[PDB]
């Protein structure tokens, strides 16, 4: 029987979070650090993210705005730099690892002057301001939250969207079940599990897309656009 929830795989919630914080504290503040040695795929990723996002920026009644985005688990700001700052007037970043947010000030360069808030906080402890963001971007971090905390964080994100705003989750997906990585202290969930959590947060899918052109050996990656 596959496991269907984090409650079947996490021995100790406090250790699940503390071990992950210790893991990221020892990763270099570089794109290759953010991407687990796959820094070279960054451009494939950003190009696909941009095309996925631009779906929602078309003129019409539901056009997503371009005033402010939130980059969740932003790290040094790879996505903030290459995807979000060029499209949004301001961007906020949230990440648990202070040293990454410090490095971001260098990494982002001149355009980083349009980063407004640098929040050093776990997502599980973060309440974004109501009615603040056009796009909330959550990439390669949801596996660091328990199911309960991910559901709650998505509920708080829903409350922080502007009119026509969206949440985007982009992450690894397991073929089946819920799989623990005890080295970095994270989980990989199958598409049914992720969809269950999104539904439980009172969100609906606008779109779902598999990332193409990835190395054959890694977990498949999907993007979801939600409101």
């Amino acid at each position: 029987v596959p496991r269907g929830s984090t409650s079947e795989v996490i021995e100790d919630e406090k250790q699940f979070y503390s071990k992950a914080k210790t893991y990221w504290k020892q990763i270099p503040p570089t794109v290759d650090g953010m991407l687990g040695g796959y820094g070279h795929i960054s451009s494939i990723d950003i190009n696909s993210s941009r095309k996925f996002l631009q779906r929602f920026l078309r003129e019409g009644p539901n056009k997503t705005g371009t005033s402010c985005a939130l980059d969740c688990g932003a790290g040094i700001g790879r996505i903030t730099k290459r995807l979000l700052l060029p499209l949004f007037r301001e961007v906020d970043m949230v990440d648990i690892t202070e040293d990454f947010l410090v490095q971001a000030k260098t990494y982002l360069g001149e355009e980083g002057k349009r980063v407004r808030n640098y929040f050093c906080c776990g997502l599980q402890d973060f309440t974004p301001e109501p009615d603040s963001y056009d796009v909330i971007w959550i990439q390669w971090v949801i596996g660091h939250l328990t199911d309960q905390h991910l559901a709650e964080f998505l509920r708080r994100c829903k409350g922080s969207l502007r009119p026509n705003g969206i949440i985007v989750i982009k992450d690894n997906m397991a073929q089946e079940g819920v799989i623990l990585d005890d080295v970095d202290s994270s989980v990989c969930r199958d598409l049914d599990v992720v969809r269950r959590i999104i539904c439980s947060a009172g969100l609906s899918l606008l779109a779902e897309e598999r990332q193409e052109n990835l190395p054959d050996e890694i977990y498949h990656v999907y993007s979801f656009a939600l409101r």
């Binding site: 690894n172 799989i179 990835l214 977990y219």
Partner: peptide
């Protein structure tokens, strides 16, 4: 992050 299937 991009990760090898365990």
């Amino acid at each position: 992050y991009p990760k090898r299937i365990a």
